[PDB]
Amino acid sequence: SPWTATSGSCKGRCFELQEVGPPDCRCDNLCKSYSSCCHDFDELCLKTARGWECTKDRCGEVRNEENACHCSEDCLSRGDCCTNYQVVCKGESHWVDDDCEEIKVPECPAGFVRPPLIIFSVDGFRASYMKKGSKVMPNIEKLRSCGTHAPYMRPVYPTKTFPNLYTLATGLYPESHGIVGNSMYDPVFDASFHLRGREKFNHRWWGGQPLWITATKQGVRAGTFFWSVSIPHERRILTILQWLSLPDNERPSVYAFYSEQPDFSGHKYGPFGPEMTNPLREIDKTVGQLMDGLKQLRLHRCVNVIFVGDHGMEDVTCDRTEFLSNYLTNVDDITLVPGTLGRIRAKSINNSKYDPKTIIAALTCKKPDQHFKPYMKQHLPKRLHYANNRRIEDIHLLVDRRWHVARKPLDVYKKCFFQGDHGFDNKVNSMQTVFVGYGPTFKYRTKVPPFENIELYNVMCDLLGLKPAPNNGTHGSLNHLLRTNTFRPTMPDEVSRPNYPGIMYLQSEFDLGCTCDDKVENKLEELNKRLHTKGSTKERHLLYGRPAVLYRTSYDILYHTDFESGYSEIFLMPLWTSYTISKQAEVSSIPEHLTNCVRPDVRVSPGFSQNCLAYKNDKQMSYGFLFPPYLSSSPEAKYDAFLVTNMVPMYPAFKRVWAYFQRVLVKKYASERNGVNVISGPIFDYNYDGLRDTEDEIKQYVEGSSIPVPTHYYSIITSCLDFTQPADKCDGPLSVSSFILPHRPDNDESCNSSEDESKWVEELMKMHTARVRDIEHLTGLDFYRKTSRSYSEILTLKTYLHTYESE
């Protein structure tokens, strides 16, 4: 390691805020972790004498600087009283014993320019501990009941510690901030990141801009967020309280506490082992020390406190391990990053025999109850946002909750007794964690719906008056947590205006190789057809306004009896198709005579249309329709569903999924939700960056054509939250579920796909559930432009994820 001159001194420097560089010895809260503290750091900065609590006998003692904390009359002015000083010595109450009283305005001491923010972060604090441990956590239960709380907060994938803490700090997905696991190899650096050792302290791992840097760059001082493991929790609290006693111009406005518990014990004992009660009690006692200490400093109605976890904890035992050696012939030629997720790469880049395709195949649906599923990273559910980083191996194993994956059996017993772990898919209930906000800027006695931890950075910025660095939150989506300091964004400006084409082409101008048995012949209904094509039913089918197109392109709005679309002249297909299905709608067949019907659209030039010949010649690719012919309002309207402008390229394997969605599931949802509005369309994300591809990024076309092949198909399914009102006459808040289905040429993902669609398609769709915001990123469209609802409410709706977990 680098040389440090430990012969310097921490006198007058204990828990200094500014870092000093090698070779200078350190006195900060992380110095122990770098083995670089000055020789007298323990003696001066980690005093322990007489413990952490005042007692009657110590009240008004002569100050003894040796003591861990003080009970002398000068201690409040020095800022170093034991947290219970005023209770024991001055007849005050513990904070927890005081009634909840609304904090309508900050009540801060003179010299405080803004309410400080204290983040109280807890590792492995599973969401359900707030109910199941409530009898042993009175301080936490008071924060929860009196402040603003969610029933749970969704972590990021993988549900590991450093990825989640750093997402809290940055607002970024792991793929963007770079901490993609607790273990990583970076092929460009040729460097490895591990929990143990020095490499993880190198700045090149840590991307984005974390909150303490955002603060500092904008003139807001920060406490150092990382605490060496051996610093007792009592000392971390005392350190924060001492910093809060610094002069105004020296004093931070943002702070973080961290606890390794309950994660540490949860690994040993399982999430609900009897041994878990004590760690929860201890954390609660720490919270009480903080709050008593704030009360002493007259800050308990001034500071905003966030109580937040990184991830939950699941029951996992050594016996529930899958071994790759039971699947692969070649297990010595791979490197596996193991555990609650798998990542596989070649052991040697000089091995020309390594082949990811044969590895995937050998891992796919090989054992009936197989407890992991292999994916190429681009095929992972888009909601995980887990692909666009060179540190993420191409081959990924999604491991079932309660299981591990390992390379060989000896890997498990050459080192177990553990009973808990985490890392699984971030929709899994056991992985959910906690959020409580308490203070003047948060709401009083308020429950908010579950939300994702990527959203918190923005809020913490709002709490501190900071402009957030660019991040993956949706700023304004959490305004409903806040009494004040809301962020009031404007809707993005539409970049491309639509064309509204009329009838401009004769049938014979088209030479598309299409056919349709549609030659059948009325002045009464002549006018009706013309009205429908000029948009007379658009209010029924486009319920929340046209989506706005946020990039430069050429597209047409096309109206029909049963659906409206925004048709791209560049991609030769809709960007979006919008239609409403009432609870009373009937499903019908595709008539025998229309099975292979495709019809030219006389509003759209031959040159801006798909053609049927390309599909005939492309022996791998077929086609489907975005507005489903099955849900036509009448036999005559059904002809509109067969327009070439409603056609999209679909692999036969995918058509099985799509047809079941369209013929069975849409009507099921309309029945259950009292009507639904559906917006469906293609997505192109060939570079797996979560963002709309430009034309030049497209890697596959329908053979012999310029018709690009989507990587995914989306649908956004909206109805009235009050399901006593039909989707098309909803006066209040909305309810949404969405999906982003991978457009794959096989159903290998679905191990039961040989069975009828009723046994597997809906399961696939649930796995590929999505937020509206995910679709916005992937399409460059902006939805819900014209509703009766507040914009912040709509932002919340766009971040909603339908998870399909139990309670």
Ligand X SMILES: *[C@@H]1O[C@H](CO)[C@@H](O[C@@H]2O[C@H](CO)[C@@H](O[C@@H]3O[C@H](CO[C@H]4O[C@H](CO)[C@@H](O)[C@H](O[C@H]5O[C@H](CO)[C@@H](O)[C@H](O)[C@@H]5O[C@H]5O[C@H](CO)[C@@H](O)[C@H](O)[C@@H]5O)[C@@H]4O)[C@@H](O)[C@H](O[C@H]4O[C@H](CO)[C@@H](O)[C@H](O)[C@@H]4O[C@H]4O[C@H](CO)[C@@H](O)[C@H](O)[C@@H]4O)[C@@H]3O)[C@H](O)[C@H]2NC(C)=O)[C@H](O)[C@H]1NC(C)=O
Ligand Y SMILES: N#Cc1cc(Cl)cc2c1C[C@@H](Nc1ncc(C(=O)N3CCC34COC4)cn1)C2
Which positions lie near K ion, rule CB under 5 A?
615, 618, 622
Question: Do the annotations mark residue 685 as ligand-binding?
Answer: yes
**With CB under 5 A as the contact rule, which of the stretches 255-263, 389-397, 435-443, 563-571 interacts with Zn ion?**
255-263
**With CB under 6 A as the contact rule, which of the stretches 673-681, 688-696, 699-707, 730-738 interacts with ligand X?**
688-696
Length of the chain: 807
Q: Is 177 in the site for ligand X (CB under 6 A)?
A: yes
Angle (nearest 5°) at CA 215 between 214 and 220? 155
**With CB under 5 A as the contact rule, which of the stretches 257-265, 325-333, 626-634, 698-706 interacts with Zn ion?**
257-265
Q: Which of 707, 710, 624, 610 is nearest to 661 (CA)?
A: 624
Residue 443: which residues within 8 A CB-CB, separation 6 or more? 147, 148, 480, 481, 482, 483
Which of residues 615 and 625 has its CB atom nearest to K ion in the complex? 615
Q: Is 691 in the site for ligand X (CB under 6 A)?
A: yes
**With CB under 6 A as the contact rule, which of the stretches 114-122, 167-175, 263-271, 737-745 interacts with ligand X?**
167-175
**Which of Zn ion, ligand Y, Na ion, none does residue 263 bind (CB under 5 to 8 Å by kind)?**
Zn ion
**b vs e for 722-748, b when ≥16 Cβ sit within 10 Å of the residue's Cβ?**
eeeebbbebeebbbbbbbbbbbbeebb
Binding site for Na ion (CB under 5 A): 747, 750, 753
- The residue from 148, 161, 474, 561 that is catalytic is 161
Phi, psi of 65 (to 5 degrees): -65, -15
Question: Least distance from C-beta 642 to ligand Y, angstroms?
Answer: 54
**Which of Na ion, ligand X, ligand Y, none does residue 690 bind (CB under 5 to 8 Å by kind)?**
ligand X
Which of residues 226 and 804 has its CB atom nearest to ligand Y in the complex? 226
**Which of K ion, Na ion, Zn ion, none does residue 750 bind (CB under 5 to 8 Å by kind)?**
Na ion
Q: Is 562 in the site for Ca ion (CB under 5 A)?
A: no
Q: Is 310 in the site for Ca ion (CB under 5 A)?
A: yes
**With CB under 6 A as the contact rule, which of the stretches 127-135, 348-356, 457-465, 685-693 interacts with ligand X?**
685-693
List 781's β-bridge partners, or say none.
549
Alpha-carbon Rg of the chain, whole angstroms?
30
Please report how many Cα atoms fall inside a 13 Å half-sphere around the Cα of residue 719, on the Cβ side: 22
**Which of ligand X, ligand Y, K ion, none does residue 176 bind (CB under 5 to 8 Å by kind)?**
ligand X
Q: Is 172 in the site for ligand X (CB under 6 A)?
A: yes
Please tell me the distance from the alpha carbon of residue 620 to that of residue 520, in angstroms, as a whole number. Answer: 34
Question: Do the annotations mark residue 203 as ligand-binding?
Answer: no
Indicate if 161 belongs to the active site: yes
Residue owning tokens 């992972």: 380
Cα 22 to chain centroid, rounded: 38
Contact 28, 11 (CB under 8 A): no
Q: Is 412 exposed, middle or buried (0-12, 13-18, 19+ CB in 10 A)?
A: middle
Q: Is 524 exposed, middle or buried (0-12, 13-18, 19+ CB in 10 A)?
A: exposed
Please tell me the distance from the alpha carbon of residue 705 to that of residue 610, in angstroms, as a whole number. Answer: 8
**Which of Zn ion, Ca ion, ligand Y, none does residue 165 bind (CB under 5 to 8 Å by kind)?**
ligand Y
Q: Which of 273, 311, 339 is nearest to 124 (CA)?
A: 311
Question: Do the annotations mark residue 743 as ligand-binding?
Answer: no
Which of residues 590 and 795 has its CB atom nearest to K ion in the complex? 590
Share in percent of the chain as helix, strand, coil (round to 5): 30, 20, 50
Question: Do the annotations mark residue 263 as ligand-binding?
Answer: yes
Q: Is 471 in the site for ligand X (CB under 6 A)?
A: yes
Contacts with Ca ion, residue ranges (CB under 5 A):
123, 161, 263, 310, 685, 687, 689, 691, 693
Residues known to be catalytic? 161
Q: Which residues are annotated as a binding site?
A: 123, 161, 182, 263, 267, 310-311, 422, 685, 687, 689, 691, 693
Q: Which residues are annotated as a binding site for Zn(2+)?
A: 123, 161, 263, 267, 310-311, 422
Contacts with ligand X, residue ranges (CB under 6 A):
172-173, 175-178, 207-208, 385, 388-389, 470-472, 689-691, 777
